[PDB]
Structures are given as structure tokens and as C-alpha cells.
Design an enzyme around this catalytic site. Structure first.
Site, PDB file in Angstrom:
ATOM      1  N   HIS A   1       1.732  -5.821 -27.265  1.00 35.77           N
ATOM      2  CA  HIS A   1       2.561  -4.629 -27.239  1.00 35.77           C
ATOM      3  C   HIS A   1       3.194  -4.238 -28.612  1.00 35.77           C
ATOM      4  O   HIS A   1       4.241  -4.732 -29.038  1.00 35.77           O
ATOM      5  CB  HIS A   1       3.643  -4.715 -26.106  1.00 35.77           C
ATOM      6  CG  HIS A   1       4.489  -3.454 -25.980  1.00 35.77           C
ATOM      7  ND1 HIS A   1       4.566  -2.734 -24.853  1.00 35.77           N
ATOM      8  CD2 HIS A   1       5.249  -2.732 -26.899  1.00 35.77           C
ATOM      9  CE1 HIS A   1       5.304  -1.622 -25.063  1.00 35.77           C
ATOM     10  NE2 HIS A   1       5.733  -1.565 -26.353  1.00 35.77           N
TER      11      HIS A   1
ATOM     12  N   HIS B   1       3.052  -0.675 -31.632  1.00 35.03           N
ATOM     13  CA  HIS B   1       2.499   0.668 -31.868  1.00 35.03           C
ATOM     14  C   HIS B   1       1.941   0.857 -33.270  1.00 35.03           C
ATOM     15  O   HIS B   1       2.601   0.687 -34.274  1.00 35.03           O
ATOM     16  CB  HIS B   1       3.549   1.784 -31.626  1.00 35.03           C
ATOM     17  CG  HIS B   1       4.160   1.843 -30.232  1.00 35.03           C
ATOM     18  ND1 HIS B   1       3.911   2.841 -29.389  1.00 35.03           N
ATOM     19  CD2 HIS B   1       4.978   0.938 -29.609  1.00 35.03           C
ATOM     20  CE1 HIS B   1       4.579   2.536 -28.224  1.00 35.03           C
ATOM     21  NE2 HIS B   1       5.240   1.365 -28.331  1.00 35.03           N
TER      22      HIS B   1
ATOM     23  N   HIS C   1       4.945   1.881 -20.203  1.00 32.00           N
ATOM     24  CA  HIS C   1       6.392   1.596 -20.494  1.00 32.00           C
ATOM     25  C   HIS C   1       7.410   1.929 -19.355  1.00 32.00           C
ATOM     26  O   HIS C   1       7.514   3.004 -18.839  1.00 32.00           O
ATOM     27  CB  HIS C   1       6.879   2.282 -21.748  1.00 32.00           C
ATOM     28  CG  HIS C   1       6.120   1.973 -23.001  1.00 32.00           C
ATOM     29  ND1 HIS C   1       4.849   2.288 -23.264  1.00 32.00           N
ATOM     30  CD2 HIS C   1       6.676   1.378 -24.132  1.00 32.00           C
ATOM     31  CE1 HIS C   1       4.676   1.902 -24.508  1.00 32.00           C
ATOM     32  NE2 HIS C   1       5.773   1.338 -25.072  1.00 32.00           N
TER      33      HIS C   1
ATOM     34  N   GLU D   1      12.695  -0.215 -19.722  1.00 36.50           N
ATOM     35  CA  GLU D   1      13.314  -0.644 -20.981  1.00 36.50           C
ATOM     36  C   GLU D   1      14.689   0.018 -21.109  1.00 36.50           C
ATOM     37  O   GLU D   1      15.615  -0.472 -21.723  1.00 36.50           O
ATOM     38  CB  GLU D   1      12.373  -0.256 -22.160  1.00 36.50           C
ATOM     39  CG  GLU D   1      13.077  -0.034 -23.548  1.00 36.50           C
ATOM     40  CD  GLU D   1      12.193   0.494 -24.660  1.00 36.50           C
ATOM     41  OE1 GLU D   1      11.354   1.380 -24.388  1.00 36.50           O
ATOM     42  OE2 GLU D   1      12.349   0.053 -25.807  1.00 36.50           O
TER      43      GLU D   1
ATOM     44  N   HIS E   1       8.053  -3.506 -21.507  1.00 37.65           N
ATOM     45  CA  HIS E   1       9.402  -3.986 -21.189  1.00 37.65           C
ATOM     46  C   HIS E   1       9.717  -4.528 -19.768  1.00 37.65           C
ATOM     47  O   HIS E   1       9.601  -5.684 -19.489  1.00 37.65           O
ATOM     48  CB  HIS E   1      10.361  -3.021 -21.780  1.00 37.65           C
ATOM     49  CG  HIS E   1       9.976  -2.669 -23.223  1.00 37.65           C
ATOM     50  ND1 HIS E   1      10.362  -3.381 -24.307  1.00 37.65           N
ATOM     51  CD2 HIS E   1       9.383  -1.501 -23.712  1.00 37.65           C
ATOM     52  CE1 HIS E   1      10.062  -2.669 -25.441  1.00 37.65           C
ATOM     53  NE2 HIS E   1       9.451  -1.520 -25.071  1.00 37.65           N
TER      54      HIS E   1
ATOM     55  N   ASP F   1       6.690  -4.483 -30.996  1.00 38.62           N
ATOM     56  CA  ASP F   1       6.856  -3.072 -30.756  1.00 38.62           C
ATOM     57  C   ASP F   1       6.508  -2.167 -31.969  1.00 38.62           C
ATOM     58  O   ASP F   1       5.575  -1.349 -31.969  1.00 38.62           O
ATOM     59  CB  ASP F   1       8.233  -2.823 -30.049  1.00 38.62           C
ATOM     60  CG  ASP F   1       8.195  -1.759 -28.931  1.00 38.62           C
ATOM     61  OD1 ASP F   1       9.150  -1.529 -28.142  1.00 38.62           O
ATOM     62  OD2 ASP F   1       7.174  -1.137 -28.892  1.00 38.62           O
TER      63      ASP F   1
END
Ligand SMILES: C[C@H](O)[C@@H](CCc1cccc(Cl)c1Cl)n1cnc(C(N)=O)c1
Ligand SMILES: [Zn+2]
Length: 349
Positions: free
Chosen positions: A12, A14, A211, A214, A235, A292
């Protein structure tokens, strides 16, 4: 320094929040757009965060730096390449890297991301370029790489191009669909653009993460399971606030894509509370530790390991478990997932 200098897996992370400042300054200058600073360093500190921060005070970050890359074929491929190299440097052996293709496009996308003027680089050619760079990447630094395409919460007009893109380019390098963006748009998981996109992902064996949890509530996680049918959650903290949903996902061995540093940074997690990961750890959850966005969070993977080592008692052995799990919970094909596991079983002994 290193907190677990054993190989890891990471699920996970980006791409668009994993660029080097100096690759941004480079296309900045190279391509006359003005970044708000002119050393890779002023920049970091600037797209960099060291407090929670509002949904918009946080999205504006994407405008400091994304118009340098989107539009630009060479840039896109460059970022894909140097992401890989980045992950070799953390000691990773398998990474799933995620992004939205529309958000690097300047053509055949409405609306046009980031004030770009219309150009020619389309959402399909982003995928190819990202692939080209990820594969050549893999070959040179020896990290295994898959990708994941994200749907945007606020823009379910994209979603089916997304699945389509996912099927078009499957294992060559795409493995799954995601849902990302402002999880607090109401109704958003059920926006019929997204439902149909996930449903289609089911029609044609494309793997699913989303997602949720979170920032949005436990309701958002259960729409993720029950209606979009995810295999994994990104999350999933707020999952705790519904005992029955926690229970049943523990029982189903659902995967949790945990991003510990990220969550202090973001606000999602506050520190007079029990950090959600410690619970997970106590409860023998299937979860992974993840970064992340190294860019925004001024971090590397080892950042994440440090906090749980150093702040939350995490023992190496949890480390081990968590990586085994994440490997287990990859979107790799079966045969190649076993081979990841053999790699880690052997490195962990
Ligand atoms: C998913 C994609 O891979 C990008 C999208 C960033 C973005 C841009 C425009 C509108 C929104 Cl709401 C967002 Cl989050 N990405 C990068 N980091 C995140 C994150 N932590 O949410 C999302
Ligand atoms: Zn994320």
C-alpha cells in the site's frame, strides 16, 4: 539504524506520492512549471508534512507538484522507474504500487486534472508508460513489482475505464482495482459508477482493494466488504468501532493495509488513543505495514518499522508475521505467491 533489515513486502503505497523532489524540480524547470521552491529540499519540507492538515490543505499538495509530471510521458515513466529503485533501497522484494491513471493524464479525461491544459497523453498511455518503467525497474534493481489502478471517490465516471484498464493490462503489470480519494463523500461507495466497476472486477477476476476506515466510519468499511466485495482494505482502522464487523472480518482473515506513520501524520490516528495496529497485533490480524506516501510523509518504509518497533513494542517476530501475511495477501497469482512465500520463509530463518 534499521528496524527490520530483513526483506519486506509492501502492499500500500502511492506512485504520485512517491516521487523524488528532484525529479519534480527537474520536470518543473524542464517544462516551465513553477514549483514553490528551487531546491529539492526546500521542496521536501514544503510538500512535506509534519502535522495533521485539512482535507484541502492536504490536497493542495498535489498541485505543488503534480503538474510537473502529468502530461509528460518521459516524467511518468521516470517516476515509475525511480519508485522501484526506491523500494529496492528499502529492502523490499515485492511491492504493490498504486495510482490513478487519469490523474497523470492530459487527454481523453474530463475533467482535466490540475489545470492542465489539454494535451495528448491519455489515461491509457499512462498505463503503458507506468508499466514500461515498473518493468524495466524490476529488471534493474531486482524488486518484484505489481501495480494497482485507483478509482476516485469523487469521480465514478472514471471507474469503468479503470476496470477496463485493469483487464487490458493484467500481470503485465496490473493486478487489481482500488478506491481512493475523499472517503467522506457521502454515499460514495455506493455510487453506481463505483459499484458497477467492482462488480465488473468480479465478473472478470480482477482483484480488489479499497480505501476505508482511515477517516470514514465503520459503515464505509462494511460497504466495502458487502457491496464492493473487497479482498483487502486500505487502512480499516475505524473497523474497530463495530464489534460485529471486526469480529467477522477477523474470522474471515481479511487483509488490513496499515499505514502507521501516515496515520499519525494525517490525523486519522491520534496519539492519546490506542494506535489501531497494536490492537491488530494483539488480536492476530492479517495486516501489513506500509508507507502510503514517502513524499508527503517525509518517510521511508523503515520509518514505519521504527514507530512500531520503538513506539509499540513490535518485535522482530511480528515483523516476520506481518510480512508473511502480506505475501499471503498479495494479488499475485497463486503459483507466484508461493514463491514469494518460499523466499521469505528462507530469508526469515
Ligand atoms: C489515488 C492516487 O494514487 C493519489 C490521488 C490524490 C488525490 C488527488 C485528487 C483528488 C483527491 Cl481527493 C486525491 Cl486524494 N493518491 C496519492 N496519495 C493519496 C492518499 N494518501 O490519499 C492518494
Ligand atoms: Zn493510500
Amino acid at each position: 539504524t534499521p528496524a527490520f533489515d530483513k526483506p519486506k513486502v509492501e502492499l500500500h503505497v502511492h506512485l504520485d506520492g512517491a516521487i523524488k523532489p528532484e525529479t519534480i524540480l527537474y520536470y518543473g524547470k524542464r517544462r516551465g512549471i513553477a514549483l514553490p521552491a528551487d531546491t529539492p529540499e526546500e521542496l521536501q519540507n514544503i510538500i512535506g508534512m509534519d502535522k495533521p492538515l485539512t482535507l484541502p490543505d492536504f490536497l493542495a499538495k498535489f498541485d505543488y507538484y503534480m503538474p510537473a509530471i502529468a502530461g509528460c510521458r518521459d516524467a511518468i515513466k521516470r517516476i515509475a522507474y525511480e519508485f522501484v529503485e526506491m523500494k529496492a533501497k528499502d529492502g523490499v522484494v515485492y511491492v504493490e504500487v498504486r495510482y490513478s491513471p487519469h490523474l497523470l493524464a492530459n487527454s481523453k479525461v474530463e475533467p482535466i486534472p490540475w489545470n492542465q491544459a489539454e494535451g495528448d497523453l491519455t489515461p491509457d498511455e499512462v498505463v503503458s508508460l507506468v508499466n514500461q518503467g515498473l518493468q524495466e525497474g524490476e529488471r534493474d534493481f531486482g524488486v518484484k513489482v505489481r501495480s494497482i489502478l485507483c478509482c476516485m471517490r469523487h469521480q465514478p465516471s472514471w471507474s469503468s475505464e479503470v476496470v477496463e484498464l485493469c483487464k487490458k493490462y493484467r500481470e503485465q503489470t496490473v493486478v487489481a482495482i482500488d478506491l481512493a480519494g475523499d472517503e467522506t463523500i457521502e454515499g460514495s461507495s455506493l455510487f453506481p459508477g463505483h459499484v458497477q466497476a467492482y462488480a465488473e472486477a468480479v465478473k472478470s477476476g480482477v482483484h480488489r482493494t479499497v480505501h476505508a476506515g482511515e477517516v470514514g466510519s465503520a459503515n464505509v468499511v462494511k460497504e466495502a466488504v458487502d457491496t464492493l466485495k473487497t479482498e483487502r482494505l486500505g487502512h480499516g482502522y475505524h473497523t474497530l468501532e463495530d464489534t460485529t464487523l471486526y469480529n467477522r472480518l477477523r474470522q474471515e482473515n481479511m487483509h488490513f493495509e496499515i499505514c502507521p506513520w501516515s496515520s499519525y501524520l494525517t490525523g486519522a490516528w491520534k496519539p492519546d488513543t490506542e494506535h489501531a495496529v497494536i490492537r491488530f497485533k494483539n488480536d492476530q490480524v492479517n495486516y501489513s505495514l506500509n508507507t502510503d506516501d514517502p513524499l508527503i510523509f517525509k518517510s521511508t518504509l523503515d520509518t514505519d518499522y521504527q514507530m512500531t518497533k520503538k513506539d509499540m513494542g513490535f518485535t522482530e517476530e511480528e515483523f516476520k508475521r506481518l510480512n508473511i501475511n502480506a505475501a499471503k495477501s498479495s494479488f499475485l497469482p497463486e503459483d507466484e505467491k508461493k514463491e514469494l512465500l518460499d523466499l521469505l520463509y528462507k530469508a526469515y530463518r
